[PDB]
Design a protein around this ligand. Structure first.
Ligand SMILES: *[C@@H]1O[C@H](CO)[C@@H](O[C@@H]2O[C@H](CO)[C@@H](O)[C@H](O)[C@H]2NC(C)=O)[C@H](O)[C@H]1NC(C)=O
Ligand SMILES: *[C@@H]1O[C@H](CO)[C@@H](O[C@@H]2O[C@H](CO)[C@@H](O)[C@H](O)[C@H]2NC(C)=O)[C@H](O)[C@H]1NC(C)=O
Ligand SMILES: O=C(O)[C@@H]1Cc2c([nH]c3ccccc23)CN1
Ligand SMILES: O=C(O)[C@@H]1Cc2c([nH]c3ccccc23)CN1
Ligand SMILES: *[C@@H]1O[C@H](CO)[C@@H](O)[C@H](O)[C@H]1NC(C)=O
Ligand SMILES: *[C@@H]1O[C@H](CO)[C@@H](O)[C@H](O)[C@H]1NC(C)=O
Ligand SMILES: [Ca+2]
Ligand SMILES: [Ca+2]
Ligand SMILES: [Ca+2]
Ligand SMILES: [Ca+2]
Lengths: 192, 463, 22
């Protein structure tokens, strides 16, 4: 999103998104292509067309939550417009955590494609979350195995200060201390 | 007010929040102008993700996670509790004060325990403390995980355990530790369970007695106690929780049929069995911070306004974002005379009190005795003060326990490395002849000068 | 939510408390 920080002198406006992501557009096209090919195949869901309402998250929790409020509109009206049966998304694990918090209220399945955080494997808190990407436990243990393979023992760690970097870096810390790998520094970064 | 029960659960709090933002959801039913809550940091995080979307201020009273201080993601979050950074640093100070270096860590697997234990780990590696085990717990944890954590605690020689967790999230672990009678650990408690009634129960003392924990600065709410005893399931019609409160208090249903004439003082419940109002005073200050922001709006001047061109919003048509703005420029005096001013992250700096769990000679309950304090207004290294003669270790002892990995190497001996073990785990190796060690815990053996040779005991040089 | 403490007024303050431990 734009770097404008609200001073709240005027009614807060809707933030503007930055840095168009062609890879994300290809991911959206992948979703649309899959839906179209299912709708044209007389071997999967016959006589039913699959619709879609795909939104932009801008790697931000707020945009995803606006879209999710547009996903649970009928459900939340019932608790307190076509009904979305399942959600494909989202990319970031913090974004997916917020969206899963909102979607597990109404038991709307949410199949992420890029959220690899281990925190989203807690089905007590995330009841309706699934993922087609693997969890990051094996990846952190694999970085530990790579550092062991080249016989290093003096490494540093930089983690993103989000639901992605922190759990992965803690798992790597456990695996490295198991393998007698001494971490010198452990810094947390963020785009903001 | 519209007040809901969260049940320490994200789902209930999110339903309540959807209730709060119904008018805003229609825009993007009364208009909730601000929210007071919540207790758990994961609960408050989920609630802030939604309230910050509509710029509804959310002033919590117990959520103390550092993650909630990121005002880019949490645009409308404030709190009257201090942040957890100072508390993790304070436990690092406590361990460095009693001269321990071999401690274990247990944390609730949530947005409260993990960041606090991570800050503790940074402070511990900065203060040359070795952490043996780091375990994660939850209230909804399988028996296999709890058994594994207990086995780790047993398979370890760290008497001191640092626990960032709440009461409920720690309860199953304490139950399993009690069932196995694991006596002799020294528990360092974060604020969330240092005064928890779920853990400070007299049948766990042999396991948890002598716990050294943190508490917030107590406040004063004159007349709050008399207000508490005025509760009645029929005289209170707004408070819909009063019925279930009365039922659980007197074990009756509106179970015997209730009478509506029982006395609140007859039953012993944490409702009126308090000595200090710590989180309650935080709720009081949350509500007064919102009210003083609204008064700031109400007493504005046309040339002196926080908004565009000094404009002042009207209190008859005030919006939530305006109250948020006035909560970012808030400076009001309490009933106790202190000033409450939220920082650039909406955090309220506050002192800590250090309590110890002592058994009650008469009642048999667990009494929290203030043994020290942590002054967050002081320079690093002079913030902690613990009066060690008020500490009963394990609840009965008077001797400061031992929680080092290895015993100190005497003079004339050096330290030797046990590979596969942390730096605090060393062996004692006799100095070779001609080399002396005149100190305790010396790394290498010092060579004697010329015309000089080590003693028989290798402790110094003789000509 | 049936269990809820409401009192009407000019300005409404939301509240969130753990009346139940779980
Ligand atoms: C446990 O180990 C710690 C090492 O951290 C010891 O702390 C040292 O104590 C001596 C006292 O003679 C001081 O001179 C050092 O400065 C301390 N080291 C520090 C503060 O890093 C402690 O004495 C040991 N205690 C026991 C009982 O073994
Ligand atoms: C935090 O605690 C410290 C010490 O407990 C407080 O400083 C004390 O203030 C009182 C009067 O308010 C003095 O009589 C003491 O001599 C002070 N002790 C010191 C300076 O070591 C401090 O005011 C507290 N901060 C608060 C309450 O915000
Ligand atoms: O969970 C997360 O935050 C990351 C996000 C992410 C992953 N791989 C990516 C490739 C491109 C863009 C984003 C990503 C792995 N899961
Ligand atoms: O953010 C959190 O999870 C904790 C919750 C919590 C704190 N203190 C408490 C006392 C009683 C019950 C719960 C709590 C400190 N902040
Ligand atoms: C638990 O251990 C303590 C300390 O050894 C002992 O006094 C007590 O009798 C034990 N209780 C049980 C039930 O084993
Ligand atoms: C808050 O107001 C008091 C006067 O009431 C003043 O002394 C103090 O400096 C103010 N603090 C801040 C941070 O503005
Ligand atoms: Ca995304
Ligand atoms: Ca809560
Ligand atoms: Ca509790
Ligand atoms: Ca080791």
């Amino acid at each position: 999103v734009a770097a404008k920080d609200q001073d709240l002198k005027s009614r807060p406006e809707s933030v503007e998104c930055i840095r168009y992501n062609f890879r994300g557009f290809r991911w959206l096209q992948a979703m649309i292509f899959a839906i179209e090919e299912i709708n044209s195949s007389p071997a999967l869901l016959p006589n039913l067309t699959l619709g879609y309402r795909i939104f932009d998250t801008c790697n931000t929790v707020s945009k995803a939550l606006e879209a999710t409020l547009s996903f649970v509109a009928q459900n939340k009206i019932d608790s307190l417009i076509p009904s979305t049966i399942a959600v494909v998304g989202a990319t970031g694990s913090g974004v997916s955590t917020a969206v899963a918090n909102l979607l597990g209220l109404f038991y709307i399945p949410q199949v992420s494609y890029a959220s690899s955080s281990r925190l989203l494997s807690n089905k007590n808190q995330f009841k309706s979350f699934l993922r087609t990407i693997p969890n990051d436990e094996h990846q952190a243990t694999a970085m530990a195995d790579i550092i062991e393979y080249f016989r290093w023992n003096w490494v540093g760690t930089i983690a993103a200060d989000d639901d992605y970097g922190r759990p992965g870096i803690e798992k790597f810390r456990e695996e490295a201390e198991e393998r007698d790998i001494c971490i010198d520094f452990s810094e947390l970064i963020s785009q903001y | 007010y519209r007040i809901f029960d969260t049940c320490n659960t994200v789902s209930k709090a999110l339903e309540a929040t959807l209730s709060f933002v119904a008018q805003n959801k229609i825009d993007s039913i009364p208009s909730t102008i601000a929210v007071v809550g919540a207790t758990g940091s994961g609960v408050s995080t989920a609630v802030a993700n939604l309230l910050g979307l509509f710029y509804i201020p959310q002033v919590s009273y117990a959520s103390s996670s550092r993650l909630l201080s990121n005002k880019n993601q949490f645009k409308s979050f404030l709190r009257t509790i201090p942040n957890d950074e100072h508390q993790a640093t304070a436990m690092a100070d406590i361990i460095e004060y009693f001269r321990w270096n071999w401690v274990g860590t247990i944390a609730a697997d949530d947005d409260y325990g993990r960041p606090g234990i991570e800050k503790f780990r940074e402070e511990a590696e900065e203060r040359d403390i070795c952490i043996d085990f780091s375990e994660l717990i939850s209230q909804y944890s399988d028996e296999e995980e709890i058994q594994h954590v207990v086995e780790v605690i047993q398979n370890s020689t760290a008497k001191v355990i640092v626990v960032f967790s709440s009461g409920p999230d720690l309860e199953p672990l304490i139950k399993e530790i009690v069932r196995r009678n694991i006596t002799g650990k020294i528990w360092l408690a974060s604020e969330a369970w240092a005064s928890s009634s779920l853990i400070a129960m007299p049948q766990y003392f042999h396991v948890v007695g002598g716990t050294i924990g943190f508490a917030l600065k107590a406040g004063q709410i004159p007349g709050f106690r008399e207000f508490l005893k005025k509760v009645h399931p029929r005289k209170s019609v707004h408070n819909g929780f009063a019925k279930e409160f009365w039922e659980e208090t007197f074990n009756c249903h509106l179970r015997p049929l209730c009478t509506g004439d029982e006395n609140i003082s007859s039953v012993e419940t944490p409702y009126i069995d308090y000595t200090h109002l710590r989180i309650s005073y935080n709720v009081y200050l949350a509500v007064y911070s919102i009210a003083h922001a609204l008064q700031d709006i109400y007493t504005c001047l046309p040339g002196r306004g926080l908004f565009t061109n000094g404009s002042c919003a009207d209190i008859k048509k005030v919006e939530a974002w305006q109250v948020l703005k006035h909560l970012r420029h808030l400076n009001f005096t309490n009933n106790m005379g202190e000033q409450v001013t939220f920082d650039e992250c909406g955090d309220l700096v506050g002192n800590y009190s250090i309590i110890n769990w002592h058994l009650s000679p008469e009642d048999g309950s667990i009494v929290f005795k203030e043994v020290g304090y942590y002054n967050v207004y002081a320079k690093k290294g002079e913030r902690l003060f613990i009066n060690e003669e008020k500490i009963l270790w394990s609840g009965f002892s008077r001797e400061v326990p031992f929680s080092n990995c290895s015993r100190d190497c005497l003079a004339g001996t050096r330290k030797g490395i046990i590979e596969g073990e942390p730096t605090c785990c060393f062996e004692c190796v006799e100095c070779p002849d001609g080399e002396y060690s005149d100190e305790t815990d010396a790394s290498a053996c010092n060579k004697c000068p010329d015309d000089f040779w080590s003693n028989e005991n290798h402790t110094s040089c003789i000509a | 939510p049936d269990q809820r403490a409401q009192k009407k007024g000019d300005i409404i303050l939301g509240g969130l408390f753990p009346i139940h431990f779980g």
